[PDB]
């Protein structure tokens, strides 16, 4: 079987992408943030503290004839940005773009951090990292992808994120009309539970490509591109007036500047991020200082190929017994 669903940016900056997901019987449709950096499927629900819900669509397990409470199971997650949520666990039927999994663990939020409450357009997250990171206790639960794997035509999913435009998540098949040229595959390490791989280097604008190994994770759930301080300094040095701002929390640049492109290596292939993808607009309404889309990973501890990088490519998440990542231009 296969599944295919359109994913849509939540705002004019592509801060995140939401994809409709059908949960329960009859279907309750929620718009979830597909996150290859985490492994919990959790949703705003009728159990969420009422003051912490502000416009989100909620899952109501009592209205689903297929929902079953998972006795004694709880979950609690903390994301790298400081966000968190926690609650209890149901199993229910979950469908993505025609692809149905029965008995999927659906984690019902009882408490969420302020960043989720203020994001009225995100009804929850759908984790797509490896199931070793799932936070359900005492019995760890499997991801939607892991549950669907056996029935998929091919054990893969692909991310085709749009720049200021809709895109597509496909499960079980590779759309050969969605990319140009060839797909270049690269080795994945699962030892930390992430889609972790090694980029072969980088270039800034039309500059010389620097061959250097950059270990990082492919994370649809993170907005920006987080790279080592040396790389990020070399990029912003080509932008007149750009500087690192402690008060703002990263590199900013005069909004009137034109940004250079950024190239990253995938084996012998090259993915080019257009400079416009790196502009994240004024730091505050009316400001002439703009926030950069490439930032240092030094405080994070791991490099993150987030949406800024992934939306420049067609990305194959190959969940074969030896998993690999594929990148193609588009
Ligand atoms: N998108 C989920 C996520 C959040 C944080 C991290 C970090 F920062 F710990 F690497 C990775 C993945
Ligand atoms: N990386 C996972 C993640 C995704 C979205 C959010 C936000 F923006 F909704 F708070 C936080 C963390």
Curated annotation (Swiss-Prot):
Catalytic EC class: hydrolase
Active site per UniProt: 35, 199
Coiled coil: none
Residues covered by the Peptidase A1 domain: 17-328
Disulfide bonds: 255-290
Entry keyword set: Aspartyl protease, Disulfide bond, Hydrolase, Protease, Signal, Zymogen
GO aspect biological process, one term: proteolysis
Entry EC number(s): 3.4.23.22
Any one GO molecular function term: aspartic-type endopeptidase activity
Catalytic reaction list: Hydrolysis of proteins with specificity similar to that of pepsin A, prefers hydrophobic residues at P1 and P1', but does not cleave 14-Ala-|-Leu-15 in the B chain of insulin or Z-Glu-Tyr. Clots milk
Family: Belongs to the peptidase A1 family.
Protein name as annotated: Endothiapepsin
Organism: Cryphonectria parasitica
